[PDB]
A paper describes a structure:
G6PC1 contains a transmembrane domain (TMD) composed of nine transmembrane helices and an extracellular domain (ECD) formed by two extracellular helices and two extracellular loops.
Additionally, to explore the changes during substrate binding and product release in G6PC1, we determined its cryo-EM structure in the apo state at a resolution of 3.4 Å. Since G6PC1APO represents the ground state, the open state of the ECD in this structure signifies its lowest energy state. To illustrate the details of the substrate-induced conformational changes in G6PC1, we performed a structural alignment between G6PC1APO and G6PC1G6P using TMD as references. Notably, EL2 undergoes dramatic rotation toward the active center, which, together with other changes in ECD, reduces the volume of the substrate-binding pocket from 1651.0 Å3 to 1364.0 Å3. Consequently, the unrestricted ECD tends to return to its lowest energy state, adopting a conformation positioned further from the membrane.
Author numbering: 1 to 141, 147 to 351
């Protein structure tokens, strides 16, 4: 008893055509929305702004982002999901019927399985935390104005992200809906785990080691049964309208090490002695200092992101990417605040 989900697939294709045929003067806006929702905006912009306003929100945001990435990868390995494009030129569902018309944008022609919507899940898991934390903080203040403004803003962001993903013919509506719901779930369930604070340096190492070991073991186990993990490459190549648009990548472990490096860097920065005298110092928590630290961290991280590891060797690429991802939280809470405190020295 198993029947095809071509009903959902055709509903997605018709949704893409409906969105494309009318809003033909909005491709730039949807591209801009799709490029901002990228997760390299919660480790470089959102984190240093929230870590100094209140130290508890930043750690929760970072943990939610890392766990969301890990779950995204692990479940993406084992779901074998299609995409809006690449399914209308291959399936025989429109064999005795008519075939709609789908146009391909350069941002389209993705090369990986798209069962969990990474952009939507990360955006939900990162924005739910911000909204709920702001609502909790602003309790000291007739209250159905700020609440409704914040929730309407959050839902508008989610709807715009989903529409951007559908309009570019990169994910079906159910994929992004499930991704949004899973991100909300992970944020909600991390909102109650209170052992992530004041955690020992040994515990962070054990957690990171467990995540890495489980990922590698799972990756090998699936290869040890007869599961194919490269079906997305040849089919994407054959049904993409231009080979130049395709962005073939040869890194099976690309975001895993980046997330693990971010987690390890946060642990080291939190448990290092230099942070204790820099951000927990004596009479240095007056607000202009925090604002200056935020501005300096943002500027220096933006300048520092403009590097690329050498791809001529794979192991060196992985090691350097891990080190950079570790420096991202190790240089925004530890060294810059201490340098600014010493500047306050003279």
């Amino acid at each position: 008893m198993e029947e095809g989900m071509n009903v959902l697939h055709d509903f997605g294709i018709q949704s893409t055509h409906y969105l494309q045929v009318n809003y033909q003067d909005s491709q730039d806006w949807f591209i801009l929305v799709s490029v901002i929702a990228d997760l390299r905006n919660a480790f470089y912009v959102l984190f240093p702004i929230w870590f100094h306003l209140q130290e508890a929100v930043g750690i929760k945001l970072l943990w939610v982002a890392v766990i969301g990435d890990w779950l995204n990868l692990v479940f993406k390995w084992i779901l074998f999901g299609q995409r809006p494009y690449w399914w209308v030129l291959d399936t025989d569902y429109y064999s005795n019927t008519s075939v709609p018309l789908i146009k391909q944008f350069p941002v389209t022609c993705e090369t990986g399985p798209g069962s969990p919507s990474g952009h939507a899940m990360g955006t939900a898991g990162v924005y739910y935390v911000m909204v709920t934390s702001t609502l909790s903080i602003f309790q000291g203040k007739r209250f159905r104005c700020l609440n409704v403004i914040l929730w309407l803003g959050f839902w508008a962001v989610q709807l715009n992200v989903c529409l951007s993903r559908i309009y570019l013919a990169a994910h079906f509506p159910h994929q992004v809906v499930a991704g949004v719901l899973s991100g909300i779930a992970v944020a909600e369930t991390f909102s109650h785990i209170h052992s992530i604070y004041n955690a020992s340096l040994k515990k962070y190492f054990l957690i990171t080691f467990f995540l890495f070991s489980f990922a590698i073991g799972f990756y090998l186990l699936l290869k040890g049964l007869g599961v194919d993990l490269l079906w997305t490459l040849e089919k994407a190549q054959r049904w993409c309208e231009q080979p130049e648009w395709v962005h073939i990548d040869t890194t099976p472990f690309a975001s895993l090490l980046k997330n693990l490096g971010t987690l390890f860097g946060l642990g080291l920065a939190l448990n290092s002695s230099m942070y204790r005298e820099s951000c927990k110092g004596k009479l240095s928590k007056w607000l202009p200092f925090r604002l200056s630290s935020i501005v300096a961290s943002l500027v220096l991280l933006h300048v520092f992101d403009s590097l690329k590891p050498p791809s001529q060797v794979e192991l060196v690429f992985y090691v350097l990417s891990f080190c950079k991802s570790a420096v991202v939280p190790l240089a925004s809470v530890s060294v810059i605040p201490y340098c600014l405190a010493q500047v306050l020295g003279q």
